[PDB]
Design an enzyme around this catalytic site. Structure first.
Site, PDB file in Angstrom:
ATOM      1  N   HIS A 200      20.419  28.024  54.489  1.00 22.83           N
ATOM      2  CA  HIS A 200      19.672  28.574  53.364  1.00 22.83           C
ATOM      3  C   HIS A 200      20.584  29.403  52.460  1.00 22.83           C
ATOM      4  O   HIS A 200      20.281  29.625  51.278  1.00 22.83           O
ATOM      5  CB  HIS A 200      18.528  29.439  53.886  1.00 22.83           C
ATOM      6  N   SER A 204      19.903  23.012  50.249  1.00 23.75           N
ATOM      7  CA  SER A 204      20.049  21.656  50.763  1.00 23.75           C
ATOM      8  C   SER A 204      20.913  20.771  49.870  1.00 23.75           C
ATOM      9  O   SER A 204      20.810  20.828  48.652  1.00 23.75           O
ATOM     10  CB  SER A 204      18.672  21.034  51.042  1.00 23.75           C
ATOM     11  N   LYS A 226       4.935  17.402  51.410  1.00 25.44           N
ATOM     12  CA  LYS A 226       5.802  16.320  51.873  1.00 25.44           C
ATOM     13  C   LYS A 226       6.115  16.505  53.360  1.00 25.44           C
ATOM     14  O   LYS A 226       6.174  15.528  54.107  1.00 25.44           O
ATOM     15  CB  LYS A 226       7.092  16.241  51.044  1.00 25.44           C
ATOM     16  N   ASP A 227       6.217  17.757  53.799  1.00 28.99           N
ATOM     17  CA  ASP A 227       6.485  18.040  55.198  1.00 28.99           C
ATOM     18  C   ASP A 227       5.299  17.776  56.123  1.00 28.99           C
ATOM     19  O   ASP A 227       5.494  17.528  57.322  1.00 28.99           O
ATOM     20  CB  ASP A 227       6.957  19.469  55.355  1.00 28.99           C
ATOM     21  N   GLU A 270      18.332   7.439  80.617  1.00 27.32           N
ATOM     22  CA  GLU A 270      17.375   7.281  79.528  1.00 27.32           C
ATOM     23  C   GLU A 270      18.012   6.669  78.285  1.00 27.32           C
ATOM     24  O   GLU A 270      19.228   6.776  78.103  1.00 27.32           O
ATOM     25  CB  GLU A 270      16.784   8.639  79.191  1.00 27.32           C
TER      26      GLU A 270
HETATM   27  C1  HEC Z   1      25.296  17.366  64.288  1.00 28.29           C
HETATM   28  C2  HEC Z   1      24.673  18.124  63.088  1.00 28.29           C
HETATM   29  C3  HEC Z   1      23.207  18.477  63.145  1.00 28.29           C
HETATM   30  C4  HEC Z   1      22.313  18.419  64.169  1.00 28.29           C
HETATM   31  C5  HEC Z   1      22.477  17.756  65.503  1.00 28.29           C
HETATM   32  C6  HEC Z   1      21.107  19.094  63.730  1.00 28.29           C
HETATM   33  N1  HEC Z   1      21.316  19.626  62.477  1.00 28.29           N
HETATM   34 FE1  HEC Z   1      19.890  20.420  61.317  1.00 28.29          FE
HETATM   35  N2  HEC Z   1      21.081  20.147  59.739  1.00 28.29           N
HETATM   36  C7  HEC Z   1      22.428  19.872  59.771  1.00 28.29           C
HETATM   37  C8  HEC Z   1      22.892  19.777  58.422  1.00 28.29           C
HETATM   38  C9  HEC Z   1      24.320  19.488  58.080  1.00 28.29           C
HETATM   39  C10 HEC Z   1      21.810  19.918  57.596  1.00 28.29           C
HETATM   40  C11 HEC Z   1      21.872  19.963  56.055  1.00 28.29           C
HETATM   41  C12 HEC Z   1      20.756  19.212  55.269  1.00 28.29           C
HETATM   42  C13 HEC Z   1      21.229  18.578  54.091  1.00 28.29           C
HETATM   43  O1  HEC Z   1      21.685  19.281  53.164  1.00 28.29           O
HETATM   44  O2  HEC Z   1      21.123  17.330  53.916  1.00 28.29           O
HETATM   45  C14 HEC Z   1      20.710  20.208  58.422  1.00 28.29           C
HETATM   46  C15 HEC Z   1      19.414  20.373  57.966  1.00 28.29           C
HETATM   47  C16 HEC Z   1      18.430  20.904  58.784  1.00 28.29           C
HETATM   48  C17 HEC Z   1      17.184  21.447  58.314  1.00 28.29           C
HETATM   49  C18 HEC Z   1      16.716  21.475  56.867  1.00 28.29           C
HETATM   50  C19 HEC Z   1      15.814  20.234  56.608  1.00 28.29           C
HETATM   51  C20 HEC Z   1      16.603  19.109  56.321  1.00 28.29           C
HETATM   52  O3  HEC Z   1      16.756  18.217  57.179  1.00 28.29           O
HETATM   53  O4  HEC Z   1      17.282  19.063  55.275  1.00 28.29           O
HETATM   54  C21 HEC Z   1      16.486  21.913  59.391  1.00 28.29           C
HETATM   55  C22 HEC Z   1      15.135  22.563  59.316  1.00 28.29           C
HETATM   56  C23 HEC Z   1      17.238  21.577  60.604  1.00 28.29           C
HETATM   57  N3  HEC Z   1      18.416  21.067  60.145  1.00 28.29           N
HETATM   58  C24 HEC Z   1      16.929  21.990  61.883  1.00 28.29           C
HETATM   59  C25 HEC Z   1      17.486  21.252  62.912  1.00 28.29           C
HETATM   60  C26 HEC Z   1      16.955  21.191  64.251  1.00 28.29           C
HETATM   61  C27 HEC Z   1      15.688  21.826  64.743  1.00 28.29           C
HETATM   62  C28 HEC Z   1      17.859  20.511  64.999  1.00 28.29           C
HETATM   63  C29 HEC Z   1      17.681  20.098  66.431  1.00 28.29           C
HETATM   64  C30 HEC Z   1      17.976  21.290  67.374  1.00 28.29           C
HETATM   65  C31 HEC Z   1      18.985  20.157  64.149  1.00 28.29           C
HETATM   66  N4  HEC Z   1      18.712  20.627  62.895  1.00 28.29           N
HETATM   67  C32 HEC Z   1      19.950  19.226  64.499  1.00 28.29           C
HETATM   68  C33 HEC Z   1      23.232  19.619  60.873  1.00 28.29           C
HETATM   69  C34 HEC Z   1      22.534  19.149  62.045  1.00 28.29           C
HETATM   70  C1  UQ2 Z   2      14.853  22.481  51.828  1.00 25.54           C
HETATM   71  O1  UQ2 Z   2      15.248  22.434  53.199  1.00 25.54           O
HETATM   72  C2  UQ2 Z   2      14.238  22.703  54.101  1.00 25.54           C
HETATM   73  C3  UQ2 Z   2      13.203  21.690  54.466  1.00 25.54           C
HETATM   74  O2  UQ2 Z   2      12.983  20.584  53.678  1.00 25.54           O
HETATM   75  C4  UQ2 Z   2      13.953  19.552  53.817  1.00 25.54           C
HETATM   76  C5  UQ2 Z   2      12.172  22.034  55.494  1.00 25.54           C
HETATM   77  O3  UQ2 Z   2      11.243  21.221  55.651  1.00 25.54           O
HETATM   78  C6  UQ2 Z   2      12.189  23.300  56.291  1.00 25.54           C
HETATM   79  C7  UQ2 Z   2      11.034  23.538  57.275  1.00 25.54           C
HETATM   80  C8  UQ2 Z   2      11.330  24.238  58.613  1.00 25.54           C
HETATM   81  C9  UQ2 Z   2      10.492  24.418  59.730  1.00 25.54           C
HETATM   82  C10 UQ2 Z   2       9.071  23.893  59.792  1.00 25.54           C
HETATM   83  C11 UQ2 Z   2      11.048  25.268  60.866  1.00 25.54           C
HETATM   84  C12 UQ2 Z   2      10.738  24.823  62.301  1.00 25.54           C
HETATM   85  C13 UQ2 Z   2      11.834  25.342  63.242  1.00 25.54           C
HETATM   86  C14 UQ2 Z   2      11.764  26.480  64.061  1.00 25.54           C
HETATM   87  C15 UQ2 Z   2      12.959  26.822  64.921  1.00 25.54           C
HETATM   88  C16 UQ2 Z   2      10.555  27.392  64.121  1.00 25.54           C
HETATM   89  C17 UQ2 Z   2      13.284  24.275  55.955  1.00 25.54           C
HETATM   90  C18 UQ2 Z   2      13.429  25.621  56.607  1.00 25.54           C
HETATM   91  C19 UQ2 Z   2      14.304  23.956  54.909  1.00 25.54           C
HETATM   92  O4  UQ2 Z   2      15.217  24.774  54.675  1.00 25.54           O
END
Ligand code: HEC
Ligand code: UQ2
Ligand code: HEC
Ligand code: UHD
Lengths: 378, 51, 105, 48, 111, 61, 75, 51
Positions: A200, A204, A226-227, A270
């Site tokens: 944040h 994004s 959308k979510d 698995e």
């Molecule tokens: C190996 C890398 C990777 C893993 C695994 C991963 N994240 Fe992320 N996550 C990121 C990155 C990098 C972004 C950046 C989003 C973007 O800008 O496209 C992100 C984005 C997000 C977002 C913002 C929504 C979205 O997708 O843009 C959330 C919420 C999130 N992650 C939570 C999680 C959770 C919960 C897990 C499972 C524990 C997890 N992430 C697993 C690297 C990852």
């Molecule tokens: C613009 O990017 C983002 C999204 O849109 C792509 C999301 O949808 C969410 C929604 C996150 C949720 C519901 C948190 C659940 C996880 C825990 C550990 C309570 C976040 C924060 C975000 O930054």
């Protein structure tokens, strides 16, 4: 003025999920972030309601889960929801790392790096998870995976026993494991918040890879709704599994009570470990094979350093686009190989896909990126 | 992409931080020796082989 | 002067059309990864080029949102594509590499 | 092996008929709120 | 936020007192507006176009005096409550609330 | 009647977030009946003699 | 984090908008929608499809070959 | 220490928010009735006594 903006707690919420500028622009491939979240608590809730009835001693550990499904009111949904939830947690993980790689998201170092730590952690949890009913897949699960540490020079043996509770997989292993499998998801939740804090900071990335500062939109109401559709669609793909095909994405071996004397012929982990399984038995070295498995995942750590292209996303890079789907299909290939026994074509094709994975990522994609530079005169 | 870091100054500055970095591995290993009671090493140490 | 350098050009024009940033009214310099070197060169852009750049990107992210593309007429012709950033970007890297040599002695 | 069998298939029918109402309605709810953004018209009006 | 929450307060929970203030404020505006040949002439001319009469000041006092808190909450709710606004915005307007969020402001969930 | 009814709905029931919420809550009770009726009866009709609800008459008292 | 009002600098751009109570949620959904998805697939097939058909043929071959391998015919 | 809140305006403003607060308990109870399937109450409701 607005309570939502200044109250110390509501502040945090509003800055993250209400007033937060998201791109106008991010697509379904972004829904996985939240669905990963939705997965983590759905696993926490069913996992809890299950823990109220489960017991962690070997002589009772099968019998307890049976108890759950058949006697515990709705223990079946509560359990197959939990068991499917887990694979669903994997479909989301793999899709989310999918999106991350395609679109250049890894550029944000600490976020992706936290996310790598997240993946290992959730892997480690789900392994511990399927050990718990003390089926066949469970025992040789707990056997083979721990035994990986034996490949460490000079010290591996001692560690393998140290985590086991002594001299082989036993009573002291299941109790142990139940505790670890309980504490790790809360730890996951901590790290997911750290992950978010780091995200944040930048906000994004988006399908184009060009900065969307110029067209941001408030998270509410757009990405709240959308979510929600996204979340519903996750509940569909979850409830279809639990209510029509509960057993599909699991081995039936886990339905036979663990026999430390068997090791069944048609053995496998698995499905979400099948890609990885393939990779490790493609080497006739103990030391080499495990070091292949490590590097199978801790490769993600290297991906940022191998970025080569003057552009962030893959959206305008057809060479890289191609080598990307080559990676997906190759991973499907390794899943499929993981799923077949160590016999004739299966062996060679499996070694090849192993070489291809480490080729595509380590050598093929950086070059392809560079060629497109020279193609754009860049 | 580390070409940046190759010049007279950088080698002076590495050469500066060498006795320190030397001692930091002395700290780190001897700590690991003591914390694991490494057996293999500690037999060499008079007084400390208490057997 | 050459049949073959018109071919490397034809390969280049292919890849250009194939990349398909054009399709959303973008120019090659709209698409560049923002690092520090890039960020500064955007800083250095004159008012009009900057304002034109923000509009191109704004129009494109809008299309990208609605999953659409321009009329073929309105796409960016490969020949008509100005590397408005190039000289700035080059001057920035040039200045950085100086600082980098000075840091070496 | 599975006494829940007919109970789970019963809930499944509901799940299918329920999703069959909700998915179009949740879709209609999103499509609405994004309708502002989906139909927005840009005009650029610089000097000279 | 504050402008919108005002509209809504007045839609839902206009107290008796402030309405007497507004009533006075309006009377004071009105008498004060009709000060000397030019305003009064303009009001003669316009009024005949728009009402077909001149409406005498006493009639306005009558029309004003009728209004109280209910007459406010009613006539406000009729025009304001849960209605799509027109927004126009100019200059450094990054933080101008998204239209949905503005339109959300046009009703309270508590009510 | 067939056009000005979404209107009639909105005035009476949908303007106020109270009566809105009351409508969804009053509306949900009536829906839970009609659904667990209809769908159970749909589920009945697709088996017709597979289930102990139909067998019942066989083994009496 | 980062906040509206403090994001970036933008000059000379008019956005025209419409209230969702003034407009269709589903406008020309099949009239315009189906032409787009075709166009988008057309756009992407040659990048996405070939590795998966490459997988397809290696799967149906490896199946065919594996079980044929566990056979003799003479001696 | 609530002497503050006793005056003509406050009673107008309570009298304003009364039909709303009325309906909010209607919402809240009927929801609790439905969510617990309160038996005792629901027997009164035609259609909904499904027994
Ligand atoms: C190996 C890398 C990777 C893993 C695994 C991963 N994240 Fe992320 N996550 C990121 C990155 C990098 C972004 C950046 C989003 C973007 O800008 O496209 C992100 C984005 C997000 C977002 C913002 C929504 C979205 O997708 O843009 C959330 C919420 C999130 N992650 C939570 C999680 C959770 C919960 C897990 C499972 C524990 C997890 N992430 C697993 C690297 C990852
Ligand atoms: C613009 O990017 C983002 C999204 O849109 C792509 C999301 O949808 C969410 C929604 C996150 C949720 C519901 C948190 C659940 C996880 C825990 C550990 C309570 C976040 C924060 C975000 O930054
Ligand atoms: C997606 C990772 C994951 C998370 C997170 C998780 N579980 Fe599990 N857990 C599983 C898996 C996999 C199983 C085994 C499913 C199976 O094959 O029966 C399981 C099984 C269990 C079981 C034994 C009953 C059974 O179905 O086998 C208990 C008890 C349990 N988990 C408790 C918890 C608790 C408590 C939490 C919250 C701390 C938790 N789980 C969260 C993966 C997870
Ligand atoms: C992040 C900590 C590391 C834990 C991650 C686990 C990696 C998965 C690899 C699968 C390993 C595996 C085997 O190799 C194997 O032979 C068997 S037979 C039953 N399960 C497994 C099994 O699970």
């Amino acid at each position: 003025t607005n309570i939502r903006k200044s109250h110390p707690l509501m502040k945090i919420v509003n800055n993250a999920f209400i007033d937060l500028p998201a791109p106008s622009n991010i697509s379904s491939w972004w829904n996985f972030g939240s669905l990963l979240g939705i997965c983590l608590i759905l696993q926490i809730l069913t996992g809890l309601f299950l823990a109220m009835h489960y017991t962690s001693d070997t002589t009772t550990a099968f019998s307890s889960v049976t108890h759950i499904c058949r006697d515990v009111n709705y223990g079946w949904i509560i359990r197959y929801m939990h068991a499917n939830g887990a694979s669903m947690f994997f479909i989301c993980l793999y899709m989310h790392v999918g999106r991350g790689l395609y679109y250049g998201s890894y550029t944000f170092l600490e976020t992706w790096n936290i996310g790598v730590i997240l993946l290992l952690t959730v892997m480690a949890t789900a392994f511990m998870g399927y050990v718990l009913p003390w089926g066949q897949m469970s025992f040789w699960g707990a056997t083979v995976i721990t035994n990986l540490l034996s490949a460490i020079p000079y010290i591996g043996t001692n560690l393998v026993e140290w985590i086991w509770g002594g001299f082989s997989v036993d009573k002291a292993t299941l109790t142990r494991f139940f505790a670890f499998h309980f504490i790790l998801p809360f730890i996951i939740m901590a790290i997911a918040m750290v992950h978010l804090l780091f995200l944040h900071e930048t906000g994004s990335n988006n399908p184009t890879g060009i900065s969307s500062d110029v067209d941001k939109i408030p998270f509410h109401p757009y990405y709240t709704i959308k979510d929600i559709l996204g979340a519903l669609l996750l509940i569909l793909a979850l409830m279809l599994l639990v209510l029509f095909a509960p057993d599909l994405l699991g081995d039936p071996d886990n339905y036979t009570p663990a026999n430390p004397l068997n090791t069944p012929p048609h053995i496998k982990p698995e499905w979400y470990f099948l890609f990885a399984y393939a990779i490790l038995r493609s080497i006739p070295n103990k030391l080499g094979g495990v070091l292949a498995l490590a590097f199978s995942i801790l490769i993600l750590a290297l991906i940022p350093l191998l970025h080569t292209s003057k552009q962030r996303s893959m959206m305008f890079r057809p060479l890289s686009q191609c080598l990307f789907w080559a990676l997906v299909a190759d991973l499907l290939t390794l899943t499929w190989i993981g799923g077949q026994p160590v016999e004739h074509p299966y062996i060679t094709i499996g070694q090849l896909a192993s070489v291809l994975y480490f080729l595509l990522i380590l050598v093929l994609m950086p070059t392809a990126g560079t060629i497109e530079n020279k193609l754009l005169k860049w | 992409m580390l070409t940046r870091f190759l010049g007279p100054r950088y080698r002076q500055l590495a050469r500066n931080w060498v006795p320190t970095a030397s001692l930091w591995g002395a700290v780190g290993a001897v700590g690991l020796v003591w914390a694991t009671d490494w057996r293999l090493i500690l037999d060499w140490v008079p007084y400390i082989n208490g057997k | 002067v050459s049949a073959s350098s018109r071919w490397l050009e034809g390969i280049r024009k292919w890849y250009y059309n194939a990349a398909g940033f054009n399709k959303l009214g973008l120019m090659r310099d709209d698409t560049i990864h923002e690092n520090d070197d890039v960020k500064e060169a955007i800083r250095r852009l004159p008012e009009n080029l900057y304002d034109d750049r923000v509009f191109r990107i704004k129009r494109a992210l809008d299309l990208s949102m609605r999953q659409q593309i321009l009329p073929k007429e309105q796409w960016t012709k490969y020949e008509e594509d100005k590397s408005y950033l190039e000289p700035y970007l080059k001057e920035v890297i040039r200045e950085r590499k100086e600082r980098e040599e000075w840091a070496k002695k | 092996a599975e006494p829940e069998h007919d109970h789970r298939k019963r809930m499944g029918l509901k799940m299918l008929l329920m999703m069959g109402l909700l998915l179009p309605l949740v879709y209609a709810m999103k499509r609405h709120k994004w309708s502002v953004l989906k139909s927005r018209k840009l005009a650029y009006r610089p000097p000279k | 936020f504050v402008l919108q929450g005002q509209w809504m307060r007045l839609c839902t929970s206009a107290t008796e007192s402030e309405v007497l203030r507004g009533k006075n404020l309006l009377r004071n505006a009105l008498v004060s507006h009709l000060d000397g040949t030019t305003p009064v002439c303009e009001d003669i001319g316009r009024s005949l176009l728009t009402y077909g009469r001149r409406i005498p000041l006493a009639e306005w006092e009558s029309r004003i005096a009728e209004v109280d808190a209910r007459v406010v909450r009613e006539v406000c709710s009729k025009y304001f409550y849960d209605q799509c606004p027109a927004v126009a915005g100019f200059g450094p307007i990054e933080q101008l609330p998204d239209y949905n969020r503005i339109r959300s402001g046009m009703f309270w969930l508590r009510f | 009647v067939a056009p000005t009814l979404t209107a009639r709905l909105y005035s009476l029931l949908f303007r106020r977030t109270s009566t809105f919420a009351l409508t969804i809550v009053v509306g949900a009770l009536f829906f839970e009946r009609a659904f667990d009726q209809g769908a159970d009866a749909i589920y009945e009709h697709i088996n017709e003699g597979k289930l102990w609800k139909h067998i019942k008459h066989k083994y009496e008292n | 984090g980062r906040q509206f009002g403090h994001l970036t600098r933008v000059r000379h751009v008019i956005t025209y908008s419409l209230s969702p109570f003034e407009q269709r949620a589903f406008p020309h959904y099949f009239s315009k929608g189906i032409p787009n998805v075709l166009r988008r697939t057309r756009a992407c097939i040659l990048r996405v499809a070939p590795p998966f058909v490459a997988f397809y043929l290696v799967y149906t071959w490896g199946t065919q070959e594996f079980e044929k391998s566990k056979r003799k015919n003479p001696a």
